[PDB]
Structure 1
Amino acid sequence: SVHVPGPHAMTIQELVDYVNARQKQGIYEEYEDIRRENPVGTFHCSMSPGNLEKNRYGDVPCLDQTRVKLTKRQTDYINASFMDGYKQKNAYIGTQGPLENTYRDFWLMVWEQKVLVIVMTTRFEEGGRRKCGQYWPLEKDSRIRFGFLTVTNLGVENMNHYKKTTLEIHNTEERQKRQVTHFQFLSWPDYGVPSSAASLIDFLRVVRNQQSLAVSNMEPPIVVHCSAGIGRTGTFCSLDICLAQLEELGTLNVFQTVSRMRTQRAFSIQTPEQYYFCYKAILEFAEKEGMV
C-alpha cells in the first residue's frame, strides 16, 4: 500500500498543535499546495471516443494507471479507480455515480471485483439537478437484470443519516449468488461537508463492521462513490485511512494521506472545506475519545 506511516507521522497531540499553529487559512493554503502538485499519470482511456459518454462529468476523468478494467464485455472502461487503504492494497474502488448507460458496467465491476459492500454518499438529486442514477432496485422485492447479472432487493433499513439495503447479485451464466450490502448516506451534499463529523464517523464504523462481517462469511475493495466520486469519496476514504492509522499506531498524517490518494483516485478531496474537515473530524473524534 502507498499508505504507510512514514516519514512524518504525527501523534494526536502534535496534530492539535499543528492545526493550532496553522489555523483554518493555513489549512486552506495547505490544500492549495496539494492541488498544485502535477498529477502523476495520464487520462487517455477516459478521454477516448466510446468512453467519453461513460463519464458523468467532462472535467472528472480517471487515471489510466489505476483504473478498474472490465473483463467480461462495449469497452473495458468504467470511471473507477483502485485505491489503497491503511496497510491494505486496493481497499477501495473510488467511482462516479452510475449513469443509465453505465449501470451494467457498474454491476459487472462489482461482480468481477468480488465487492461485498457499496458506499454511496450522495442523493440522486441535490439542488435541482441529477447527481446519480437509480442503478439498484429501490424497493424490497424488486429486481433488475443487467445482462447475466440479476440484482434483487432483499430488504431496506432506514437509519438516522443513512439507509442500509441488502442486495443479492445472481450471475445467471455461472449460476452463482452473492449478497452485497448497499449504504446510502443522505446528509452530505456535493461540494460540502456532512452536517456532523460524529454521524459520518458512526457511519464509517457501521461500514467497517459490515465489511468485516461479510469477509468472515466468505480482501475485496469497498466501492465508494458520490456523484463524481472524488470530493466526498476522497474525504470519506482519507478519514478512514487516518483513523485506522491513529487506532493502530497512534499517529497519522493528513497531508501525506491525501497527497498519496490523489495519485490513485485523481482529484480526491474537492474543496479546502473538505480538506479542513478531515483535520477537524479527527480532532473532534480525539476529544470525544479523551485524548483531548
Structure 2
Amino acid sequence: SVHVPGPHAMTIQELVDYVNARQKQGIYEEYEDIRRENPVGTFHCSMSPGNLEKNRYGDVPCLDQTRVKLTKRSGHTQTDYINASFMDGYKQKNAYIGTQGPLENTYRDFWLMVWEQKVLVIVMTTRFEEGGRRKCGQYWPLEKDSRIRFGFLTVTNLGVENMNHYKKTTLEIHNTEERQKRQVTHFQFLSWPAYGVPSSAASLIDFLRVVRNQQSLAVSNMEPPIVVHASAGIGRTGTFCSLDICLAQLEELGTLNVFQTVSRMRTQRAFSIQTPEQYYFCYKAILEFAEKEGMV
C-alpha cells in the first residue's frame, strides 16, 4: 500500500500541536499545497469519446493508472471504463474503490465492477439530489424485494435498515450467467452534503465503524475493496477514505499523517478531498475522536 506511516507519521499529541501551530488557515494552506502537487498520472481513458458520457462531471476524470477496469463487457457502449479508482488503505492495497455516483448509463458498469471486484460493501455519501440537482442515480433497487437486472447481474434489495444519518441496504447480487450470488451491503450516509463536511464527525466515525464492521463481517464469510462513492466520488469520498486510513493507522500504530494520506490518496483517486474544509475536517475529526477517546 502507498499508505505507509513514513516518513513523518505523527502521534496524536503531535497532531494536536501541529494543528494548533497551523490553525485553520495553515491547514487550509496545506490543503492548497496538496492541490498543487505535480499530478502524477493521466486521464486519457476518462477523456476518450465513448467514456466522456460515463463521467458524471467534466472536471472529475479518473486516473488511467489506478482506474478500475471492467472486463466482462457487453454491448458497444460498455467499454472497459468506469469512473472508479483503486485506492489503497492503511496497510491494505486496494482497500477502496473511489467512484462517482453512478449515472443511468453506468449503473450496469457499476454493478459489473462490484461483481468483478468482489465488493462486499458499498459506501454512498451522497443523496440522490441536492438543490433539486441529481447528484447520483438510483442505481440500486430502493425497496425490499425490488430487483433490477443489469445484464447478467440481478440486484435484489433484501432489506433496508434506517439508522441515524445512514441507511443500510442488504442487496443480493445474482450473477445469472454464472449462477452465483453474493450479498452486498450498501450504506448510504445522508448527512454529508457535497462540498461539505458531515454534520457530526462523531456520526461519520460511528458510520465508519459500522462500515468497517460490516466489511470485516462480510469478509469473515468469504480482501475486496469497499466501494466508496459520493457524487463525483472525490470530495466526500477522499475525506471518508482519508479519515478511515488515518484512524486505522492511529488505532494500530498510534500515528497518522493527514497530509501524507491525502497526498498519496490523490495519486490514486485523483482530486480526493475537494475543499479545504473537508481537508481540515480530517484533522478536526481525528482530534475530536482523540479527545472523545481520552487520547488527548
Shared fold per TM-score greater than 0.5: yes
Please state whether the residue corresponding to 1:102 is helix, strand or coil. helix
Secondary structure of the corresponding residue to residue 282 of structure 1 = helix
Q: Distance in 1 between matches of 2:16 and 2:50?
A: 49
Structure 2 distance, partners of 1:170, 1:26, is: 49
Aligned residue for 2:203, secondary structure, equals helix
Tell me which residue corresponds to 1:68.
Answer: 68
Equivalent-residue separation in structure 1 for 2:20 and 2:149 (angstroms): 53
Distance (whole Å) between structure 2 residues aligned to residue 112 and residue 245 of structure 1: 28
* Matching residue within 166, 187, 192 for 1:183: 187
Correspondence for 2:204 among 200, 205, 218 = 200
1:272 CA displacement: 0.3
In the TM superposition, what whole-angstrom CA distance separates every residue of 1:257-283 from its partner, at most 9, and x where no partner exists?
000000000000000000000000000
Report what 2:127 is aligned to: 123
CA deviation after TM superposition for structure 1 residue 38, in Å: 1.8
| Aligned-partner SS, 1:78 | strand
Identity between Structure 1 and Structure 2 (%): 99
Question: What's the offset of the Cα at 1:175?
Answer: 0.6
Q: Structure 1-normalised TM-score?
A: 0.99
Give a deviation string over 1:67-103, Cα, whole Å, max 9, x none.
0000001210000000000000000000000000000
Q: Distance in 1 between matches of 2:244 and 2:39?
A: 23
**How much does 1:127 deviate?**
1.5
SS of the equivalent of 1:157 reads strand
SS of equivalent to 1:7: coil
**Do structure 1's residue 230 and structure 2's residue 234 form an aligned pair?**
yes
Post-superposition Cα deviations, 1:140-163, rounded to whole Å, max 9, x if no partner, equal 011111111111001011001000
Aligned length: 292
SS in 2 for 1:83: strand
- Find the residue that maps to 1:217 and give its secondary structure: coil
1-structure distance, mates of 2:208, 2:290: 15
Q: Cα distance, 1:121 vs. partner?
A: 0.1
Which residue in 2 is equivalent to 1:220? 224
Q: Aligned to 1:68, what secondary structure does the other structure show?
A: strand
**Cα distance in structure 1, aligned partners of 2:283 and 2:68:** 30
- Aligned-partner SS, 2:68: coil
Q: CA deviation at 1:291?
A: 1.2
Q: Identify which of 90, 97, 105 aligns with 1:86.
A: 90
Instruction: Write the deviation string for residues 205-230 of structure 1: whole angstroms up to 9, x where unpaired.
Output: 00000000000111000000000000
* Structure 2 counterpart SS, 1:155: strand
Give 3-state SS (helix, strand or coil) of 1:276's partner: helix
- In structure 2, C-alpha distance between the alignment counterparts of 1:19 and 1:144, rounded to whole Å: 47
* Structure 1 outlier segments of 4+, above 2 Å: none
- 1:233-289 CA-to-partner distances (Å, cap 9, x unmatched) read 000000000000100110010000000000000000000000000000000000000
CA distance in 2, matches of 1:218, 1:26: 45
Shift of 1:164: 0.4
Shift of 1:128: 1.9
Unpaired runs of 5+ residues, structure 2, are none
SS in structure 2 of the partner of residue 178 of structure 1? strand
2:252 to 248, 251, 262: 248
Residue 79 of structure 1 aligns to a residue in which SS? strand
Structure 2 distance, partners of 1:190, 1:162, is: 16
CA distance in 2, matches of 1:166, 1:68: 23
